[PDB]
Design a protein around this ligand. Structure first.
Ligand SMILES: Cc1ncc(C[n+]2csc(CCOP(=O)(O)OP(=O)(O)O)c2C)c(N)n1
Ligand SMILES: Cc1ncc(C[n+]2csc(CCOP(=O)(O)OP(=O)(O)O)c2C)c(N)n1
Ligand SMILES: [Mg+2]
Ligand SMILES: [Mg+2]
Lengths: 323, 362, 361, 323
């Protein structure tokens, strides 16, 4: 049956919690309220306060406690109300969570998940729109996943919960209820570290993920009207990203445009772009072009313009095509 | 005079019958007392106007402050607007109004028009004014606490005689930066007053699941500074206790932590739903504690209030609101280009390139 | 019997002349009392062996714990090693030793040899042991406090009957994560005991410039939990108060904050210069409070110590140190490739590529 | 006069403080101790405790209070003992400092400087070796400078103190006393945002900065002996970086190797590399090659293997030259 991303995420949580008593949920307003976006709705009622717990208003406490719980015996799925608010608990994330296995020679592990809504397209201003994935990708020891469809949301969240490595799970808030897709109720997982081919093409490769998918997909549609077949590749996992899928697509088309709503400088798409250039220069028929968020804090008034538009993506595609 | 610290019972000055309970004489002239009342009505009416702005789609977000009027107006009058500094949070529009920030600017920010001196950079409920030293609201909870401490240290070092007041809710007291900032201010004996507008909830998380200390005032023990538990629905108790803390800071005796117990009558925000976690029984109990009718009785018992004046003040306030909204709206939308302004004093090469890129699309 | 919370004067049980000052009768057998002394001597001698390792260049960094022996040894004995969990910081090697961690592993980590179960991944003074639930030391001050709270919450939810003890210095109490972590543990009524080894200094910054609360114990009021001010140079006072807090935690009554007042006799670290910010009058005043001679006098008055025993114990420890160091060195250097192991459970494509790149070198 | 970087930095501070009463220094152990690296030695004795203040052990307090001081009227130079410890005060840096001017429509400003020792090569393990500049460059609103010579240290620090925009000033600790260079006693500043050419060449461009300079210059010297003329460009300022200086060199040589000790993924050099590929594809005779720190936490035992070696840099140069 069809369901939104919120429902798929809720289902994934419900399913894993029923399967493993060790799986617990913690964060601000996740219990009684069921989450500010209702992702954890009904879980407290079904599993109890010792499985779903509202925490004090401290991201350091949430992330850090989750790390301790994971190291001792639980499988915590912590929630940071908005990706923008991970910073108060940033040291816990980069100094404790990310480095635990490494610094302890593998003696201690962190089987935990930190999920958080992210991205703009919802007029969130400075702290209700950020996409901080670059900060996580840059930190060795953290797996990073950003979903864009209900089907992936359920499959990848279940995979993250089963994965023993710490996973930062980003959920583009604009996509929480933007569409109802078929999501099997049957138990299934999706592979972390693997991209998903949304549309096959041979004239242009469109590398993207999360928040910008709607515009990227419509841009490909517009291009199709002009006889241009764009291959759309949703990376899904940002760390470790699907090196092979990316290079295979770029080798085929010879031209690539990478899209994300995260700020340009030292962004994840910049990493992929630099890697394509370093490894596939000989296959490039045009320069790798990046369409990203601007290097400014996220603006409220110009929210509509900060987030890459179909036009902005198309202009970059034309540039790559006419090169 | 010195109020008692860490009292088990919140400090009160207004009797339920309008009697004065102070262990010192009331020294506010009738004119000043009526102004406190006037500002609370204005704050309440602004909040009710906000509800309408949400309905009519004029603004996309509001944080109801109804129930916080005594606390917010008291704070605004306990300091010197334009001289002392204020580090507020999103629910302080009543304080902003009482402080003197033009409605045009407050509403301009709510509507993101050019009337907003903050240039529509953030979502609603993020006012800020250089003129009135109202440090622009930031979204991360308690992130403004360390800066408040820093501003106060600057005031001390530069011998300006200013004080910095910092307001926050009960949830904010759980953040590490809240603790870290106040600790530094205390160690430096900085002129900062930290004030909690405790409504017993952080969206849906109640006080009991927020912290284990019986009160927020008790936390002052962790800094070696005085802590006060006050009836935040009592405008006089709030005014005098905060004022005393301000004077203490001004004379170089260091910071204080003042807990003003209030109640959030409306939901957490327009994006929330109050009746989704609070017993209508608790809301009703606190509804009988509305700070406005309580102070009205106090003024009435002293020949400082009557129905005619009441209506006169309300009509003047609604006219100010209408005029304020009109000015804010006629200001016009903020230009798309402004998205690249103020990141730095001047736009670097990359921002100039990005601005040119956007223009291709406009 | 219980101990008074938030006392004016730090709690003490050992008199100036070695007499027992407790209200209750001492209930520790002579054999256990001798063990406490033995472990303090071992800790002190380990600290002195570390000083030598620096001089010979065997290790590049040490954090002198001389002066913290009573506190660290008391903590090791107040909990159940291998059952309860410990979340220590860099200066707790005395606690690690008394807890039972093999000298081979401690020295292996100091020398970064394969004897280090932590695989020489961090600089010296970063021990960690899965076997003894000794959560590997992390450098950022107080960063281990929230994790400690989390493990305690897990112990509570899983009803393991375990307790988590978390140690840190006075400077650590100024970090936001210290406060945030304890606050959550308190709200959850988690079985965690937070213990401050207060030596009145955070490198060169003194207590007065660290916080304005007269004591660290007073900070407990911010969490609504019991706070205790203890004479950390008194191994018995430290043992009993920490023990009481641990039992309270174990029976489900929530966390406590125990302040153990001690003194750091050596410099902040081998990279520091003590004699550059501390008065000789203060240092002299505290050297006269060394926990070792103090407990020695207590034992002697009870017929539990004699000069001959001291000689024998020191010889035993001396030999244990040499044997441990030998085993640590004999383990050999950690392979260069280990630098790519344990980042994740398995090496992703980019680390496999980076490993291969280095091999070419 | 001839002086080390520490002396150059100390002189800069002394000079700016003598010139402006508003300039104050704050941080852990900066007062009586004179700093753990002696950068602030003697300042307390000369200017008093109200201008050189030891702070409690809190990076959020240091950075946040510094922000408050700057907004009110002082010009603080905050020190974070090790770049590795910026995280506990991360939200203050990225949420309050970086966005103050923007979020307030320019009503409030942050004329503050955040100094911090950084870089590996000093057997510092996980937290005495990090180079987190990427985190800063990715944050809109922060200027980022990383010096490598005593001359630049004094000139750029003085410039930063005069700059009204927030500046994160990184000082590679391995270079604190590695050399004594001529540093004018007279007052002088250097331009923030301008690279420095260390060597002119036409066969290869070596883009670098901070920590790795010793090995890069050494590699350049060795290439010379082999008949290879490499051009060495020390960026100095990472944000905003010298776009023109970079493109001019690469356009001329046609081959570039970027070097840094910071982790590869989403690093600053990855950003520069991606930009070169995107804007100068037509001028590239070889793929942009990046020699960076590995994507692992900084290891203690393998300290000298993690930091880029002359050999590593030379191997990359050979790949670029032989392509
Ligand atoms: C660091 C951070 N985490 C989470 C949020 C989301 N959030 C916004 S308001 C709020 C409630 C805070 O409550 P309290 O401080 O009691 O203030 P009140 O709204 O009750 O007056 C939360 C959790 C945020 N803004 N910042
Ligand atoms: C977040 C952070 N900031 C700074 C440092 C550098 N530092 C290392 S030890 C230390 C002193 C801490 O003192 P205290 O907690 O009292 O412990 P002690 O060394 O006195 O036992 C400092 C500031 C660090 N490790 N982490
Ligand atoms: Mg509240
Ligand atoms: Mg200390």
């Amino acid at each position: 049956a069809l369901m939104t991303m919120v429902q798929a995420l809720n289902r994934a949580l419900d399913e894993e919690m029923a399967k493993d008593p060790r799986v617990v949920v913690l964060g601000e307003d996740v219990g009684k309220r069921g989450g500010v976006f209702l992702v954890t709705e009904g879980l407290l009622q079904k599993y109890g306060p010792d499985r779903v717990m509202d925490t004090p208003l401290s991201e350091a406490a949430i992330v850090g406690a989750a790390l301790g719980m994971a190291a001792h015996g639980l499988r915590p799925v912590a929630e940071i109300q908005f990706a923008d608010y991970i910073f108060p608990g940033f040291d816990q994330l980069v100094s404790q969570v990310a480095k635990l296995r490494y610094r302890s020679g593998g003696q201690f592990t962190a089987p935990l998940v930190v999920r958080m809504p992210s991205g703009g397209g919802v007029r969130g201003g400075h702290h209700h729109s950020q996409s901080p994935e670059a900060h996580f990708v840059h930190t060795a020891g953290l797996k990073v996943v950003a979903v864009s469809t209900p089907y992936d949301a359920k499959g990848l969240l279940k995979a993250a919960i089963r994965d023993e490595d710490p996973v930062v799970f980003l959920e583009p808030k604009r996509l929480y209820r933007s569409v109802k897709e078929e999501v099997p109720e049957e138990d299934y997982t999706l592979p972390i570290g693997k991209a998903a081919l949304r549309r096959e093409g041979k004239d242009l490769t469109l590398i993207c993920y999360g928040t910008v998918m709607p515009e990227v997909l419509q841009a490909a549609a517009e291009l199709a009207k002009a006889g241009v077949s764009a291959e759309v590749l949703d990376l899904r996992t940002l760390m470790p990203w699907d090196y092979e899928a990316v290079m295979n697509s770029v080798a085929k088309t010879g031209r690539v445009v990478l899209v994300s709503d995260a700020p340009r400088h030292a962004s994840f798409v910049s990493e992929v772009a630099a890697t394509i250039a370093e490894d596939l220069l000989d296959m490039l028929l045009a320069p790798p072009i990046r369409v990203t968020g601007f290097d400014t804090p996220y603006p409220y008034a110009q929210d509509k313009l900060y987030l890459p538009t179909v036009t902005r993506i198309l202009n970059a595609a034309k540039r790559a095509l006419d090169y | 005079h010195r109020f008692e610290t860490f009292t088990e019972e919140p400090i009160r000055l207004i009797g339920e019958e309008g009697e004065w309970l102070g262990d010192f004489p009331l020294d506010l002239e009738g004119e000043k007392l009526r102004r406190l009342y006037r500002d609370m009505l204005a704050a309440r009416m602004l909040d009710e106007r906000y509800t309408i702005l949400i309905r009519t789609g004029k603004t996309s977000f509001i944080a109801p402050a109804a129930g916080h009027e005594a606390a917010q107006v008291a704070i605004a009058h306990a300091i010197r607007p334009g001289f002392d500094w204020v580090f507020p949070y999103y629910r302080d529009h009543g304080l902003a109004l009482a402080l003197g920030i033009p409605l045009k600017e407050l509403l301009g920010q709510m509507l993101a028009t050019k009337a907003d001196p903050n240039k529509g950079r953030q979502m609603p409920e993020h006012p800020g004014s250089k003129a009135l030293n109202f440090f622009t609201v930031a979204s991360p909870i308690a992130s403004h606490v360390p800066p408040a401490a820093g501003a106060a240290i600057s005031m001390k070092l530069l011998r300006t005689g200013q004080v910095a007041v910092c307001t926050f809710g009960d949830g904010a007291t759980s953040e590490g930066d809240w603790y870290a900032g106040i600790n530094f201010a205390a160690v430096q004996g900085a002129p900062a007053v930290f004030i909690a507008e405790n409504n017993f909830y952080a969206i849906s998380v109640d006080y009991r699941h927020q912290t284990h200390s019986p009160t927020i005032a008790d936390k002052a023990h962790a800094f070696g500074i005085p802590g006060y538990l006050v009836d935040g629905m009592d405008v006089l108790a709030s005014y005098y206790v905060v004022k005393e803390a301000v004077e203490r800071a001004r004379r170089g005796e260091g910071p204080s932590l003042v807990e003003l117990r209030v109640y959030r009558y409306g939901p957490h925000s327009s994006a929330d739903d109050d009746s989704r976690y609070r017993p209508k029984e608790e809301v009703a109990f606190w509804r009988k504690k509305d700070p406005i009718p309580r102070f009205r009785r106090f003024l009435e018992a002293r020949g400082l209030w009557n129905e005619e004046w009441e209506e006169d003040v309300r009509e003047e306030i609604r006219a100010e609101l209408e005029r304020g909204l009109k000015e804010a709206e006629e200001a016009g939308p903020v230009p798309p280009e402004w998205m690249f302004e103020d990141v730095f004093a001047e736009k670097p090469w990359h921002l100039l390139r990005q601005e040119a890129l956007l223009k291709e699309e406009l």
